[PDB]
From a paper:
The protein TON_0340 (268 amino acids) was identified in a transcriptome study aimed at identifying genes whose expression is enhanced when this organism was grown with CO as the sole carbon and energy source. The biological function of TON_0340 is unknown, and a BLAST database search shows that TON_0340 belongs to the DUF4392 superfamily (after domain of unknown function), the members of which are found in all three domains of life. To gain insights into the biochemical function of TON_0340 and its homologues, we determined the crystal structures of TON_0340 in four different forms; the apo form without a bound metal ion and the Mn2+-, Mg2+- or Ca2+-bound form, revealing that the protein has a highly conserved bi-metal binding pocket. Our analyses strongly support that TON_0340 is a novel Mn2+-dependent phosphatase.
The Ca2+-bound TON_0340 structure was determined by growing the crystals in the presence of CaCl2. Unexpectedly, only one Ca2+ ion bound to the cluster of the acidic residues. The Ca2+ ion was chelated by Glu59, Asp61, Glu115 and Asp157 occupying the Mn2 site. As anticipated, Ca2+ exhibited single-site interaction with TON_0340 with the deduced KD of 970 nM. Notably, TON_0340 was not activated by the addition of Ca2+ or Zn2+. Consistently, in the asymmetric unit of the Mn2+-, Mg2+-, Ca2+- or Zn2+-bound crystals, six molecules of TON_0340 formed three dimeric pairs which are essentially the same with each other, as if this observed homodimer is the biological unit. The two molecules in each pair are in antiparallel orientations. The intermolecular interactions, involving α1, α2 and α10, are mostly hydrophobic and quite extensive, burying a surface area of 1,202 Å2 in one subunit.
Numbering used by the authors:
A (entry chain A): 1 to 269
B (entry chain B): 2 to 8, 12 to 269
The structure:
Amino acid sequence: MIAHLINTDIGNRGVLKVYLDYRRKNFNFLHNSTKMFLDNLERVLIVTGFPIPPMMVAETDGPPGALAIYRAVEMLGGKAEILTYSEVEKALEPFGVSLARTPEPEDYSLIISVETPGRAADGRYYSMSALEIKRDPLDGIFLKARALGIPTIGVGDGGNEIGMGKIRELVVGHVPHGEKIASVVETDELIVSAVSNWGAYGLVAQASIEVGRNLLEGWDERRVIEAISSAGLIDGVSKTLAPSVDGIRLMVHEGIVELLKAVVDEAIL
Amino acid sequence: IAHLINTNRGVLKVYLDYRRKNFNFLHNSTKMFLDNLERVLIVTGFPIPPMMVAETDGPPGALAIYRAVEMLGGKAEILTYSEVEKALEPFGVSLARTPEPEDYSLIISVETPGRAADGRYYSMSALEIKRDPLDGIFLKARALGIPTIGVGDGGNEIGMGKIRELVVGHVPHGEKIASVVETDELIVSAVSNWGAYGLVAQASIEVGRNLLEGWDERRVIEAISSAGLIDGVSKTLAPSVDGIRLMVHEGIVELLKAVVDEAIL
Ligand SMILES: [Ca+2]
Ligand SMILES: [Ca+2]
C-alpha cells in the first residue's frame, strides 16, 4: 500500500515513530486526503518552499512534489497555481507552471502545502536542526483558509511543516527539538511521509488508483531533481548543490517513484 | 528496511502494531543472523489447501538468505517439501537430510506453517492444512536454546507465536489460524519473501556490502513457477506471489538495493 511505502524506513526514527502513531489512529489518512483532493479540483493553490538556515535558500524537497500534484490536477481537468519563493519559481520555470499572484484563499477550491514551514508554538519558524528561519512566511494563507472553511491538505516529513499542528503532540514526543520546532498550523487533512516529495507522489498515486489512470506516468524524478538543483535549490540536509533530497541520493527517490508507478498500474489492472 | 517490507489490510495493521511495540525487530533479527552463520538451517514451504501444494511465497526469500549466508562465509541447508526441492534444484542448494536441531548454529523459517492453539495447521482462509509438518524442529530448537528467526506475513507461520495477541486482533480467522510457535526473533512483512530480502538488506548495511546485488526476482519466480510452485492466493501457476504481479516485486527489490547502497555509501 501507498501510505506505507511513502514512509519507507530511511533512518529518521523520529518521523517513523510519528507515522506509526499517526497511522494507528488515522489508518486511512492517505485515502481521506485523496478524497478531499478529488472533490476540490476546480482551482488548486499549491504552496511550497522551505528556506534552509543559515543561507535561507529554498531546498529540493517540496518543489518536485508540488510539480507532480500540479501536473495531476491539470490532467484531471482542474486548474492549479503555485505559491512559492523566487528561486523556486525560477527552478520550475522550464516546466511552465502557473504562478499565483496576490492570492486570496477564497479564490481557490483547495489549498495544498508541500514542505512549507509552519509557525511553531512561539510563533517562530524553525528548521529540523532547530535553527530559526529568517524570511517572509507562507503559512498565513492557511490560517485564513481555515477561518474561511476552505479545504486544505498538508504534506510534511519533519514536523515543522504546515499541517503538522494536527499532530503536534506526536512531534513534540518523537522528534528531536520537537517542542521548539513543531508547527501549530493545522490543515483539514494531513499526509506524513519520510520525504515530502514522496508524500506528494503518494497523493498522486492514491488519486490515480481512485480514478483508474496512472497520473504519475511520465514523471522523471532524476530530470526534475537535476533541473531544480541546477537552478540553485539546495539539499536541505547537506545544504549543498547536490542533486539529492534530504541527504538521500537519487536512486532511492527513483526507486520510490518506480515502485509507486508499478503499484498503481497493478491496482488499475 | 523494516518498514518498506510491510507495504492485506489485516497484516498491515499487525505490522504497524508490531513495529510500534518492538521498534528494532529487523535490526535484532539481523544481529542474531550475523552472529550465527556457521551452519544455518533454512526452513520454508507452505502447503495451500485443498491441493496441499507448496507456493511461491517462501522459497525465493529462503534462496536469498541461503545465498547471503554463503557470501558471508557460512554454510546453509534447506529443509522443505519435495516439490520445493525440485523448484530450487536449478540453484544447487544443499538439502537437509535427517536434520537434528543441535547440528545448526541457527534455524530460520521463511513462510512455513506453524501449529495453532489447537495443534492443527490452517491457511489464511481458515482451511486446514493436511500434510506432514515442518515446525517440529523449532520447538526442539527453542527448548535447546538454538537461535531461531521466523519470517511471515499472515499470522499462521512459524514464529508468529511471539505476537499471537496482535494476530487475533487484526487478522480474519485470527483466533483459529494464529500459530503459537515462537522463535527468538520475528520479522513481519507484507509478503514473506520481502521480509527475507529485508533481512539480507539489513545484513548488507551491517557488513558494508550489498548482498542483494545480482538478485533477479523475475528469473527466480518464473523458475519456481515453472517447476510447479503455485501462487498462494490465486492458487494457479501464474508467475506471481500472493496475488501480486512480478513488477511490484521487482520494484520492492530494486528499492531495497538502493536503500542498501545509500547506507553503504
Ligand atoms: Ca524534508
Ligand atoms: Ca504469504
